[PDB]
Structure 1
Amino acid sequence: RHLKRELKRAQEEVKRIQSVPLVIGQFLEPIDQNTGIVSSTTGMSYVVRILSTLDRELLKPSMSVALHRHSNALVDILPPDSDSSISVMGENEKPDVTYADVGGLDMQKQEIREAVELPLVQADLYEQIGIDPPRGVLLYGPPGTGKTMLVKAVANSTKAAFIRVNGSEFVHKYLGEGPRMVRDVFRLARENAPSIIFIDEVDSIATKRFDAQT
């Protein structure tokens, strides 16, 4: 019984270390199951102890991670979901449900539902026929046809995850800073599947001819 109290107190001590303050780093690769190597936000490569009974299944894939500041050690792990790509301050979610998206272009509203709502909601149907999940959707027409609004409405009320990004999020002044966000979007979607990817601005990004004049 005496040793039970020590044990209990021994865990309490570790919780203080686990607790705030903390600093974010990024778990790299293992060197070993129970010792790994990480990189901090500060570019420093620390070889750190993997504390007992922590995540392993996902820890080894390069993934975002927390480090206790004073120990400079891996005390607990973050979801990949943590530290999401640069993304819009307001809601992805649409606050309106009244919808004029219903009343006129109704035929197109069903079509979008067909390609997009119908596989996620009913997975079951697809499995039985044997098809591959329906292919991506390009929306083009003259603007002032509410393209970015007809599809938003659906994402909002289906209540599957919705990631709403712009080319403007991606754009960067630096060197190699754009692409690292791009890799994050694709993976971020897989993590939190079923998931809806909509890039509103793509026109700007595509060019007729490549250049390097500036």
Structure 2
Amino acid sequence: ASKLPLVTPHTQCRLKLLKLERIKDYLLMEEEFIRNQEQMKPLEEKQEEERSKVDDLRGTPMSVGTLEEIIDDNHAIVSTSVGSEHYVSILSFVDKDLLEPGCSVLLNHKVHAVIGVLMDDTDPLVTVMKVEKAPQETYADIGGLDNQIQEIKESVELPLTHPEYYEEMGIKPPKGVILYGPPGTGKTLLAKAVANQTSATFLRVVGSELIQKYLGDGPKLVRELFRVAEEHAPSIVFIDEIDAIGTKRYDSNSGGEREIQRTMLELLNQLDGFDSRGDVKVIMATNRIETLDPALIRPGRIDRKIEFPLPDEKTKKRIFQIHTSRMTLADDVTLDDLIMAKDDLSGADIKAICTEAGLMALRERRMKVTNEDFKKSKENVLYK
């Protein structure tokens, strides 16, 4: 791997022909010398029989140890599974580069010497925290807003798709972004839309499960959450309903709001860690933003704040056209009457109305909706 980066000419030219001929001749002498090394110096065969001798020197089982300290000169102390640690030697082929404390190592069964390092067999919570596939429709699905969409593309999507503009700007793209507003306006979905659009690794967990039953486990949890976030890729991390951590109290926690405060100070450290952060981007969403500690919201930790207003009626009819598109509607229905049917209605409300109208039509095995279906839908959905 890592041969040479060159995509400059990309044409019928000696600036490509020369490069290709020189590199293929370099591969030619590489091939000729490696042919030299197993022809007049085969030893036995020197490619896999050496591997065979190592594998023979490798013990059949794995006395798996846990690493706790390092000594440079081909030995160290390792702790056994039963807990009786040993100061065993290492192998010459123990590939002394990916050794880290707390890691699984293949040891011998007799002398227990460090034979090799063990690849981790995945991790439980990396599977839980990582969203696998794209959820749903892209930015054509929202409708109505058309302003915060451009902003969040500028702050998140634009650094990835156009990593050139900031270079002639000589400037850094914004880091921390709050989404806020009345609930049901489309924050955690706008989250779904941007999750669909992006190609980077995506992380999602809600603040509600940041409470935990002991002391310090919350801050520790945030620690390896961000560790997983850093160790994979350029990543976008999404936390939803952060205000719950400050609003809803519980009894399952060992400590009260004190341990909550400790978790808060840890995450305030984590957003502005003086250690090298890198290309990890942060997206938040919270309806009750006023209850949060304002020092979390600061520039350097949070750069953008985006309000989500209640939808306008011209946006309401856009939502009507969007959501009722794939369903069969009769001519007797009218969206315009249903626009102002409620003074204070949300984007969840219209979807709930149309789904209830769909199931009400399914009650009588009917394919098309009628006006009375919405007329009976409105009080079922909203009015209780």
Q: TM-score with structure 2 length normalisation?
A: 0.43
1:95 — aligned with what?
Answer: 135
- 1:97 maps to amino acid: E
1:147 — aligned with what?
Answer: 187
Deviations 1:99-148 (A, max 9, x none): 66432323222221111111123232222211123120011101111101
1:54 — aligned with what?
Answer: 95
Give the distance between the partners of 1:97 and 1:159, measured in 2 at CA.
15
Equivalent residues of 1:85, 1:184 under 8 A apart: no
1:13 — aligned with what?
Answer: 56
Give the distance between the partners of 2:257 and 2:201, measured in 1 at CA.
37
Between structures 1 and 2, the one with greater helix share: 2
**Counterpart of 1:88 in 2: which secondary structure?**
helix
Larger radius of gyration: 2
Deviations 1:81-103 (A, max 9, x none): 94364663783533312666432
1:66 — aligned with what?
Answer: 104
- Alignment root-mean-square deviation, CA: 3.9
2:170 counterpart of 1:130 = yes
The partner residue of 1:76 within 117, 121, 135 is 117
Give unpaired runs (5+ residues) of structure 2.
Answer: 1-42, 249-255, 260-384
Percent of residue pairs bearing the same amino acid type: 46
Give the distance between the partners of 2:73 and 2:125, measured in 1 at CA.
29
Most deviating of 168-177 and 182-191: 168-177
1:118 — aligned with what?
Answer: 158
Offset at 1:173? 0.8
Give the distance between the partners of 2:65 and 2:189, measured in 1 at CA.
37
The partner residue of 1:161 within 177, 191, 201 is 201
- 2:207 maps to amino acid: G
Give unpaired runs (5+ residues) of structure 1.
Answer: none
8 and 42 in structure 1: CA distance in 2 versus 1, 3 angstrom threshold: closer
2:147 — aligned with what?
Answer: 107
69 and 30 in structure 1: CA distance in 2 versus 1, 3 angstrom threshold: closer
Aligned residues: 205
Most deviating of 181-190 and 101-110: 101-110
- 1:32 maps to amino acid: D
181 and 90 in structure 1: CA distance in 2 versus 1, 3 angstrom threshold: closer
Between structures 1 and 2, the one with greater strand share: 1
179 and 212 in structure 1: CA distance in 2 versus 1, 3 angstrom threshold: closer
Deviations 1:52-90 (A, max 9, x none): 35252x534x5x6223387465622447x9436466378
Give the distance between the partners of 2:164 and 2:209, measured in 1 at CA.
36
75 and 137 in structure 1: CA distance in 2 versus 1, 3 angstrom threshold: same
2:224 — aligned with what?
Answer: 184
Q: TM-score with structure 1 length normalisation?
A: 0.71
97 and 133 in structure 1: CA distance in 2 versus 1, 3 angstrom threshold: same
Give the distance between the partners of 2:136 and 2:238, measured in 1 at CA.
18
